[PDB]
Amino acid sequence: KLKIEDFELHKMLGKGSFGKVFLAEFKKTNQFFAIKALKKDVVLMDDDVECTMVEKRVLSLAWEHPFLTHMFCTFQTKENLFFVMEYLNGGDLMYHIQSCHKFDLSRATFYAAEIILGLQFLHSKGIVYRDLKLDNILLDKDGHIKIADFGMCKENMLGDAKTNEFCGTPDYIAPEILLGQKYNHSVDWWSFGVLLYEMLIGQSPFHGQDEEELFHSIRMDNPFYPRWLEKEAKDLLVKLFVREPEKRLGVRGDIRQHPLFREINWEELERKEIDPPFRPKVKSPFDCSNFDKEFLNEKPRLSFADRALINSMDQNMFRNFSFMNPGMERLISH
Amino acid sequence: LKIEDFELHKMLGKGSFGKVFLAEFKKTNQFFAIKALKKDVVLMDDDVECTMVEKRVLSLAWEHPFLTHMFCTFQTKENLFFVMEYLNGGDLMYHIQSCHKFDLSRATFYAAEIILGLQFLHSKGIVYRDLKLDNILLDKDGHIKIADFGMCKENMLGDAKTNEFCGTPDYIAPEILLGQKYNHSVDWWSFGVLLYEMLIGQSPFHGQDEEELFHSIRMDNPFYPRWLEKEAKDLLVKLFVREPEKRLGVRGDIRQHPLFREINWEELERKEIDPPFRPKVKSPFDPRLSRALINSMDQNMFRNFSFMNPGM
Ligand SMILES: C[C@@H]1C(=O)NN=C2COc3cc(-c4ccccc4)c(N(C)C4(C)CN(C)C4)cc3N21
Ligand SMILES: C[C@@H]1C(=O)NN=C2COc3cc(-c4ccccc4)c(N(C)C4(C)CN(C)C4)cc3N21
Numbered sequence: 001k002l003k004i005e006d007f008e009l010h011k012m013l014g015k016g017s018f019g020k021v022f023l024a025e026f027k028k029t030n031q032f033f034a035i036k037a038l039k040k041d042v043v044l045m046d047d048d049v050e051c052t053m054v055e056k057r058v059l060s061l062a063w064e065h066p067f068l069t070h071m072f073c074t075f076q077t078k079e080n081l082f083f084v085m086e087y088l089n090g091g092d093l094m095y096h097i098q099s100c101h102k103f104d105l106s107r108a109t110f111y112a113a114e115i116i117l118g119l120q121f122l123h124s125k126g127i128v129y130r131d132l133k134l135d136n137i138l139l140d141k142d143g144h145i146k147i148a149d150f151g152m153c154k155e156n157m158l159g160d161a162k163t164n165e166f167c168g169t170p171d172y173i174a175p176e177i178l179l180g181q182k183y184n185h186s187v188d189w190w191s192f193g194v195l196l197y198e199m200l201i202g203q204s205p206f207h208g209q210d211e212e213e214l215f216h217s218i219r220m221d222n223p224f225y226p227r228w229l230e231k232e233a234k235d236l237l238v239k240l241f242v243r244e245p246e247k248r249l250g251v252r253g254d255i256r257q258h259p260l261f262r263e264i265n266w267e268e269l270e271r272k273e274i275d276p277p278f279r280p281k282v283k284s285p286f287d288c289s290n291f292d293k294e295f296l297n298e299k300p301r302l303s304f305a306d307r308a309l310i311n312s313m314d315q316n317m318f319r320n321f322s323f324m325n326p327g328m329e330r331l332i333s334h
Numbered sequence: 335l336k337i338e339d340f341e342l343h344k345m346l347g348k349g350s351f352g353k354v355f356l357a358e359f360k361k362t363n364q365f366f367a368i369k370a371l372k373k374d375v376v377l378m379d380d381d382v383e384c385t386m387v388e389k390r391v392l393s394l395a396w397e398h399p400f401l402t403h404m405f406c407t408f409q410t411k412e413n414l415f416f417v418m419e420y421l422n423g424g425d426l427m428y429h430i431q432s433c434h435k436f437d438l439s440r441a442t443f444y445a446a447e448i449i450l451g452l453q454f455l456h457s458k459g460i461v462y463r464d465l466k467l468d469n470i471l472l473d474k475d476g477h478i479k480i481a482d483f484g485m486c487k488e489n490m491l492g493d494a495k496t497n498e499f500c501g502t503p504d505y506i507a508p509e510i511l512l513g514q515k516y517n518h519s520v521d522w523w524s525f526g527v528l529l530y531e532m533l534i535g536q537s538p539f540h541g542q543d544e545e546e547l548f549h550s551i552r553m554d555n556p557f558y559p560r561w562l563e564k565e566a567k568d569l570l571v572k573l574f575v576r577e578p579e580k581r582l583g584v585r586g587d588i589r590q591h592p593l594f595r596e597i598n599w600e601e602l603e604r605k606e607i608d609p610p611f612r613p614k615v616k617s618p619f620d621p622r623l624s625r626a627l628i629n630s631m632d633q634n635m636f637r638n639f640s641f642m643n644p645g646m
């Protein structure tokens with residue numbers, strides 16, 4: 001017995017076709033959370049039932065690593081699916097990059113390095129992420145990265161294992177996906193290269209007025225590296241933008257030992273003992289300063305649902321959705 | 335793909351044509367809209383070609399976002415089935431009746447998306463010919479979806495024209511009423527009437543019967559309230575020009591009209607502009623399917639009706 005009525009929803013942090021994200025407090029205990037609220041009819045019509053389940057299962061693994069969004073619990077009603085998360089109020093990287101256009105080399109290097117620790121952890125558990133992009137990297141109050149939105153993940157990718165779904169955000173989609181090849185963790189490293197390029201250069205590496213032109217650019221065009229770019233930043237990007245997956249850095253070699261990361265102790269980084277070069281402005285743990293005001297002004301509200309589609313729905317589609325860590329269990333029982 | 339695979343959960347609509355069904359496919363647990371047409375009624379009305387034209391135009395529809403995406407078609411010895419994506423936002427007649435008239439932003443957004451939808455059909459050589467509020471559906475996000483392509487005419491490319499008297503009375507073009515040959519122009523008069531109704535909350539031309547209504551469409555000038563935006567009038571006045579060659583949509587560039595000044599068309603066409611209105615009501619709608627004529631019918635009349643777009 002855990003319902004959304006138990007949570008007081010203070011503000012709406014984000015919104016989309018998927019659903020909404022709220023800044024939520026539990027039972028007036030000054031204990032804050034972020035709640036991604038989905039509607040089951042939306043999820044059904046979008047064909048994201050398995051994605052929702054993949055999101056829940058991956059987040060059950062994500063507790064063990066510092067640079068993934070941590071999930072306290074999940075639960076469902078007849079209409080709704082709720083992911084009760086930690087509240088990460090640093091702001092995402094897309095938001096931050098809209099303001100300054102470009103990240104300085106130390107700042108980009110730091111983010112790149114923390115993301116590597118995130119991705120390699122997922123790969124080691126047999127999870128390929130497939131939706132790496134700026135707005136899926138959330139910052140915490142101190143400025144370290146947290147990878148978010150695992151609904152596009154693929155599990156059981158250990159050993160000699162491949163998969164075949166055309167997916168990802170267009171700018172980031174790897175050429176092996178575009179070519180219809182079966183793929184492994186390699187895709188994430190091409191996307192990583194795209195993300196790193198955007199951090200450093202402030203524009204995308206590949207371009208087009210439509211997807212056909214954009215996908216062609218990803219298949220064929222040489223990425224532009226400005227004269228001002230640090231030689232090792234160029235080098236890493238080049239070694240990531242290799243179209244043959246099994247020759248790509250991150251699939252082969254050791255990406256940790258690339259000269260760009262010379263000054264990084266990876267044990268220290270992983271232990272959060274390296275102060276981030278950028279620290280976001282955060283007056284409090286309940287601060288909202290780093291979110292867009294279109295969402296924050298719009299008061300929190302749960303949408304109605306297609307009552308016909310829900311009653312007609314296969315009632316056990318979201319079986320095994322409810323998860324509950326022991327920490328949240330103590331908080332609730334008081 | 336037989337009808338027995340689908341489970342018909344709820345009826346979404348009824349008419350003289352037949353029924354629309356909220357259908358779930360068997361093993362996939364995946365939901366659709368099925369338009370079921372009785373063959374006996376189709377042959378009675380002599381709208382056999384229309385049904386075939388609907389399938390062929392729907393087979394083109396999947397490429398464009400603001401048209402209703404058909405997944406597959408098949409037939410039985412009694413019925414004809416179109417398997418369609420399920421759109422539960424409600425049609426624009428339900429919405430105009432809910433709140434009398436749409437605001438400037440909301441009307442412009444619907445006007446713009448319909449332009450892209452019609453222009454897509456026109457380049458394919460297809461004139462729609464039955465544009466009206468109750469044929470425009472909305473998806474769950476609130477983007478428009480043009481439905482009911484039964485009244486289309488194909489192969490209308492370049493110089494070509496056609497001569498059929500058809501449409502919905504309020505929306506029929508004046509050249510059609512004068513018994514003239516016509517091209518895609520006729521859709522742009524109907525677009526004007528639709529746009530008018532959205533902004534003002536009623537029809538531009540009026541009559542107690544059909545004769546009086548057709549007269550009004552031919553003769554009377556549409557009334558423009560003093561409160562109406564200058565650029566909304568300017569467009570409607572440019573759309574309501576009875577000589578098709580000088581009409582906007584046919585002549586000039588409709589997209590560069592100052593009413594669409596704030597719109598990014600390539601961005602709009604890729605669903606990257608959020609609609610100003612989202613449906614608050616989810617599925618604003620109201621189960622089983624209901625011999626001499628069928629046996630004595632030419633069995634091969636509804637041939638080559640079956641189809642499946644690779645997306646299925
Ligand atoms: C749920 C997650 C979390 O685990 N902790 N804290 C937060 C803070 O609020 C979020 C907002 C969004 C968001 C932002 C803008 C639009 C849509 C969603 C958001 N989402 C879904 C994104 C990852 C999508 N990207 C734009 C940001 C996430 C959060 N989170
Ligand atoms: C099949 C179609 C689709 O492509 N997607 N989703 C739907 C949802 O349900 C529909 C209902 C009707 C309808 C509505 C009222 C009366 C009669 C039919 C309906 N029809 C026949 C209209 C085009 C007629 N107009 C009132 C709406 C269509 C749908 N569709």
Ligand code: NA
Binds near residue numbers: 207
């Ligand atoms: Na190019």
